């Protein structure tokens, strides 16, 4: 990457970044089949299988609760549009049409009555064990069975389900991310594939599943007999490898600081601005930005990087009366504003101070620095381009 400092304005510009723009949401509806547990009873007394059966029955009882708690949250940013999706799939019609679509195959595309298409996935392993292997030997209504191997298989097969309940119970129906028990690695792989974009975008998302899980989330539909229904909204990064640049600034004092700080990515030649820090997130030299939280700015805005006194675009630099000393760290360096008259020093991690800095603005690189210190507070240099 190239990072160049602007003596005027006391800002920086790190160019050479490559976009990964979240342009849409893919919807993956899951059916976690449990296998009609509550029809099985434990009359043998205390037993290991009886502990595991109560755990599963207590789990969906609590899951039926958490759905009930957040349906009552209806009074009347991408999640608020995502529960609207969850509204249409919660009906008994869609659930049945979804379960019917998955009777034959473990995964298929189901066309919703609302004119949309979601991916339907079936995780049957729990119900398959509860019906074929479990309910056969416990059919006596006595759980103190001889095969201890069955109780340990019960613990292994129901773990994914128990964790999903814990996941939805703690976050009250909507997780902040796609976890390993919401979707496995393989289930994630099939979903991103099914997305409507080309091979390059599929390749990058498959190489960066951790960003897919990060920006994706999940909503709980509810229990329908022995079927935990929940939807997972996966991000669709439909535009990649476009130019991006970050311009972070310190107050230059005589006193002004640059208000159009933050991330900028081009999409189809139209430059777009990401003011908030959580809109964009970086992995190496790639910038994952939220398209929805984006502001289309005119391309004349790159004039703030040659001379701000250019009346082709109002660069909207802001002014303050009381000068404030600050340090805004950039990815490939640091800009230190030291206008109040304090001791300001560049340092290293095993040599100590390298040079004392003057009163004002001065840009530093990691090539000849590792820290920057004012007073007793020290700022460790790093590539925190994810900082605003």
């Amino acid at each position, epitope marked *: 990457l190239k990072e160049s400092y602007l003596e005027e304005s006391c800002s920086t510009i790190t160019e050479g970044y490559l976009s990964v723009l979240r342009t849409g949401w893919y919807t993956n509806v899951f059916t976690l089949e449990v296998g009609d547990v509550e029809n099985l009873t434990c009359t043998d007394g205390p037993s290991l299988i009886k502990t595991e059966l109560d*755990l599963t029955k207590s789990a969906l009882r609590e899951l039926k609760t958490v759905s009930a708690d957040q349906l009552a949250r209806e009074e009347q940013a991408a999640v608020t549009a995502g529960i609207a999706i969850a509204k249409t799939i919660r009906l008994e019609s869609e659930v049945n049409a979804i379960k019917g679509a998955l009777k034959t195959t473990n995964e298929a595309v189901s066309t919703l009555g609302n004119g949309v298409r979601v991916l339907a996935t079936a995780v049957r392993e729990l119900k398959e064990f509860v019906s074929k292997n479990l309910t056969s030997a416990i059919n006596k209504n006595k759980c103190d069975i001889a095969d201890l191997k069955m109780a340990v298989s019960f613990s*292994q097969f129901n*773990r994914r389900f*128990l*964790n999903v309940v*814990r*996941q939805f119970s*703690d*976050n009250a129906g909507i*997780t*902040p*991310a796609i*976890s*390993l*028990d919401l979707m*496995t*690695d393989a289930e994630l792989a099939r979903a991103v594939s099914y997305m409507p974009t080309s091979a390059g975008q599929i390749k990058l998302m498959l190489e*960066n*599943r*951790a*960003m*897919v*899980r*990060r920006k994706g989330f999940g909503i709980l539909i509810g229990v329908y007999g022995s079927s935990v229904i929940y939807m997972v909204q996966l991000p669709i990064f439909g535009v990649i490898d476009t130019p991006c640049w970050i311009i972070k600034a310190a107050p230059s004092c005589s006193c002004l600081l640059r208000e159009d700080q933050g991330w900028y990515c081009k999409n189809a030649g139209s430059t777009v601005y990401y003011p908030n820090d959580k809109d964009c997130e970086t992995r190496g030299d790639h910038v994952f930005c939220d398209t929805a939280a984006g502001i289309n700015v005119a391309e004349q805005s790159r004039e703030c990087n040659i001379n701000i006194s250019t009346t082709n675009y109002p660069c909207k630099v802001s002014t303050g009366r009381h000068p404030i000393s600050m340090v805004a760290l950039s990815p490939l360096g640091a800009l230190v504003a030291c206008y109040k008259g304090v001791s300001c020093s560049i340092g290293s991690n095993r040599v100590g101070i390298i040079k004392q800095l003057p009163k004002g603005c001065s840009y530093i690189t990691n090539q000849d620095a590792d820290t920057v210190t004012i007073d007793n507070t020290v700022y460790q240099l*790093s590539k925190v381009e994810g900082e605003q």
Partner: antibody, heavy 119, light 108 residues
Framework: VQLVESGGGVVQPGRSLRLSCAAS????????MHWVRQAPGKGLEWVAL????????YYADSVKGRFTISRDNSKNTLYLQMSSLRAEDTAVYYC?????????????WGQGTMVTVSS | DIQMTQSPSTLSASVGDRVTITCRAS??????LAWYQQKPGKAPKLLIY???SLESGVPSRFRGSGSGTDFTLTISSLQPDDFATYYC?????????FGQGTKLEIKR
């Protein structure tokens, strides 16, 4: 289903040492591998990771520039080439397995081998 | 780096008690966290990955809870095995940082 570390011993400051980690019981070629070290008494400190294929290797700032992580999926072995060893690098070194693609929780660890860098 | 702050550093409790160790990250780490049980001279044993999900083999007395920056780990009924040192770990991004550790001592 186990990892076994080897190559630890006593060395002088500035010397070199190669740790190897033998993997067995799982599809080693699929998993992203790590080295995590723990000085005597102190807590845990991640040092390095290497991806399933090897294109992406990353190190902590402490060992950055001296240590080099590598792998050979043919022999199911994880490597760490330690150079410019200082006394701070005295620690037990475990190799650990990443849980899932992007989730680097360490679900399988090795016995650990003791490295002693003292003059 | 993301600084992981555990509390308390030392927790002294008896068999049968419930016990809550808290982890705190300097930045938001979503739900990417792990809790390890380390006994003297042995490798750490993973207990719960992500925020609340339990690893295979871990008893149900272990409970996770957390989102963003503030996470907890609660052992609902102390068994003599549970007394060790517990660590939290973020894996939001590298470098992967651990907590100071929490020593679960028995009270007398």
């Amino acid at each position: 289903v186990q990892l076994v570390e080897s190559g630890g011993g006593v060395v002088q400051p500035g010397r070199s040492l190669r740790l190897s980690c033998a993997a067995s019981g799982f599809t080693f070629t699929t998993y992203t591998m790590h080295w995590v070290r723990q000085a005597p008494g102190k807590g845990l400190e991640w040092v390095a990771l290497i991806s399933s294929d090897g294109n992406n290797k990353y190190y902590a700032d402490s060992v950055k520039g001296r240590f080099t992580i590598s792998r050979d999926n043919s022999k199911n072995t994880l490597y760490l080439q330690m150079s410019s060893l200082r006394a701070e690098d005295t620690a037990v070194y475990y190799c650990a397995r990443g849980y899932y693609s992007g989730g680097d929780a360490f679900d399988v660890w090795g016995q650990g081998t003791m490295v002693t860098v003292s003059s | 780096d993301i600084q992981m702050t555990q509390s308390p550093s030392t927790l002294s409790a008896s068999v049968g008690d419930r016990v809550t160790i808290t982890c705190r990250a300097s930045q938001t780490i979503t739900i990417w966290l792990a809790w390890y049980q380390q006994k003297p001279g042995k490798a750490p044993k993973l207990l719960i990955y992500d925020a609340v999900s339990l690893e295979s083999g871990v008893p149900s007395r272990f409970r996770g809870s957390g989102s963003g920056t503030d996470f907890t780990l609660t052992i609902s009924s102390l068994q003599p095995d549970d007394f060790a040192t517990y660590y939290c770990q973020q894996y939001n991004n590298y470098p992967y940082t651990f907590g100071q550790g929490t020593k679960l001592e028995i009270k007398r």
